[PDB]
Amino acid sequence: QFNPYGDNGGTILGIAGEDFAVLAGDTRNITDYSINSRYEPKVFDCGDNIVMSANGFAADGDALVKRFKNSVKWYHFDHNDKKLSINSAARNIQHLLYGKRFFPYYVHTIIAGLDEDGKGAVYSFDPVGSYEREQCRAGGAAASLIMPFLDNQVNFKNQYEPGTNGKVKKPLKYLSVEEVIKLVRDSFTSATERHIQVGDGLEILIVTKDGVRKEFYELKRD
């Protein structure tokens, strides 16, 4: 019988800073044990300082991104070129996903950008449209490997202040863009070692008030 879904592998990662936000993803595309592409981007600049990735089944992921980009375009036409805020985009994407509640887009969606106060924002969606704003979110194949590491290094979970008898937690603080990219690179190189669907390349999209910048790093190709 015909199965309309597939798994193109890959893993993505969105981290929010104080005045910036990053959305990373590996560039490897796979089916079963085969590599389809070593460089197939799946993190996109959608306009209005919004970056987006829909990981899982690539056909559904491309369709969703394509529909959202189109949603941004029509938001400008219908509302006098008003800038689509990250929170408004998130709510719109919920309606795109839930519109196919009974034949879902088989993807894990993450968007990143700046909120209306200029502060870094990341939103994550389930396949049918439930969404939540978060500081940190990994999605895809190696999410289970990356996420507990972020909990420990970004949100400082399970780390207590030395000498305080485990009574005083290590204080939360905003990281620099340089420190965040270090964690992203180490997250993906670790995931590359232990997950077969992760590797080849790492493409990061950084969002600031100035615009959207890109950075690329090689990963192991085995």
Partner: protein, 222 residues
């Protein structure tokens, strides 16, 4: 796994990758898939990891006892026969796919065995998930009258094809050379083209980070 075997002038060479998987997860990045049945009879194994190790050790044990009983150096056809009859009896439930090779008083030999008990003869063979990638290389570059150095090159190139193109295979290349009139040389980690790059940051914690409830000295002595 990717495993291969290649015949040459005065003997035979076998090779293997070093990835061990557990689902999509890499359990061992440097596992040994080349097994010694007797001093000059070696076996490359693919499939169910425990089965390849168990069946190669059992037949190796019985081969040793047979060698002592007959006062003769063991033959590859004996290991082949003992392996296939064992595997056939278990109707494929012992998931061992092997490339058996070696030198004996009769000469140099190269065989493959499948889980259900079928054997094949050849000058070049490949087994495992990456066998197609490896066989593509073997079919492209193999020729009659190979030298020792040419056979090692061809064998390792075939394993590399699996390492890079097959997600089931990865990490390093192991080789074993069995030449007539000489001791067999086992070349563990003959190639190491997947060295992990330096990490961006050290994750060594300040001492006392971890909260502790109780401490106690354990008695290991009598």
């Amino acid at each position: 796994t990717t495993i291969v075997g290649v015949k040459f002038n005065n003997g035979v060479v076998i090779a293997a990758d070093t990835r061990s998987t557990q689902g999509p997860i890499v359990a061992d990045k440097n596992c040994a898939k080349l097994h010694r049945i007797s001093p000059k009879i070696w076996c490359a194994g693919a499939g169910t990891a425990a089965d390849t190790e168990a069946v190669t050790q059992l037949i190796g044990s019985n081969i040793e006892l047979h060698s002592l009983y007959t006062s003769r150096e063991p033959r590859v056809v004996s290991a082949l026969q003992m392996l296939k009859q064992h595997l056939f009896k278990y109707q494929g439930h012992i998931g061992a796919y092997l490339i058996v090779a070696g030198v004996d008083p009769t000469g140099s030999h190269l065989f493959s065995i499948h889980a259900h008990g079928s054997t094949d003869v050849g000058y070049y063979l490949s087994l495992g998930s990456g066998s197609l990638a490896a066989m593509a290389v073997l079919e492209s570059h193999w020729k009659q009258d190979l030298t020792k150095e040419e056979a090692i090159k061809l064998a390792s190139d075939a394993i590399q094809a699996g390492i890079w193109n097959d997600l089931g295979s990865g990490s390093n290349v192991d080789v074993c050379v069995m030449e007539i009139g000489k001791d067999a040389e086992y070349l563990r980690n003959y190639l190491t083209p997947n060295v992990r790059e330096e990490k961006q940051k050290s994750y060594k914690f300040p001492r006392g980070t971890t909260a502790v409830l109780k401490e106690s000295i354990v008695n290991i002595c009598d």
